[PDB]
């Protein structure tokens, strides 16, 4: 692809090929808690996932993705700022080259060591991800900040699966998994209108950022970094990082559910 995370094709150069990188609705952002506004219309988040929708784990070169069956509404996100249910599509992570900064979002300028994204599309209004993905109301992503510390045993199915998808394009079945198990105990959240965090950078995402973090150990993060961006047979190139810097708020308000 024409983009990545290296100095030659990374975030600071994505605007040349994707000019919306310099848009007014870009993600991630720093959440300044003193500036958030409470919206009394927000409802709690409700996640209702069916573990039989887990389908496949895929090495996509710059990251890896756990896909869910995309056929019906068996797994949905509801509540929060939404009127419509959104259909679970995938989850994935971002991480950094150091434990010091691997998240995408930051809170009061604090950088976490990784971030979980649980992505959904608006199957009430639209009929495919392809149709929804460029629409302002098309996508919803739950972000969870991951604080380095004790090993998180909830990650073990995912981490154990990585040995079968070492290089770019490899994939393997990944079944019987409810990714709400990866979320924090409480689903208190912030929300703002933003974008996918890598190309094509569409401004189509309602972000739901959990207030509570989850843990991850330094060795678990090293397992992400040990994934390889090259194809099989080519000299091994580790996926050392895949987190975008925070982007200007440009007048948006971050709403708080608490
Ligand atoms: C390869 O794409 C992704 O993995 C991804 C990542 C994000 S992220 N990182 O912003 O959560 C979103 Cl919202 C959504 C997507 S995605 O919906 O799967 C996507 C894919 C191709 C084009 C348009 C949208
Ligand atoms: Zn992401």
Numbering used by the authors: 3 to 260
Please share text taken word for word from the publication where this structure appeared.
The carbonic anhydrase (CA) family (CA, EC 4.2.1.1), consisting of twelve catalytically active human isozymes, performs the catalysis of reversible hydration of CO2 into bicarbonate and acid protons. Since it has been observed that CAIX isozyme is highly overexpressed in numerous cancers, it has been postulated that compounds inhibiting CAIX may possess the anticancer activity and may be used in tumor treatment. Here we have designed a series of compounds, methyl 5-sulfamoyl-benzoates, which bear a primary sulfonamide group, a well-known marker of CA inhibitors, and determined their affinities for all twelve CA isozymes. Eight crystal structures of CA complexes with compounds are presented in this study: 9a bound to CAI and CAII, 3b, 3d, 5b, and 9a bound to CAXII, 3b bound to CAIX and mimic-CAIX (mutant of CAII containing amino acids in the active site as in CAIX: A65S, N67Q, I91L, F130V, V134L, and L203A).
The structure of 9a was also determined in the active site of CAI and compared with the positions determined in CAII and CAXII. In this case, the results were somewhat inconclusive because two alternative positions of the compound were found in CAI. One position is partially similar to the positions determined in CAII and CAXII, and the alternative is rotated. The 9a is unlikely to occupy a well-defined position and had a weak binding to CAI (ΔGintr = −48.1 kJ/mol). Still, it showed a significant change in the enthalpy of binding (ΔHintr = −39.7 kJ/mol).
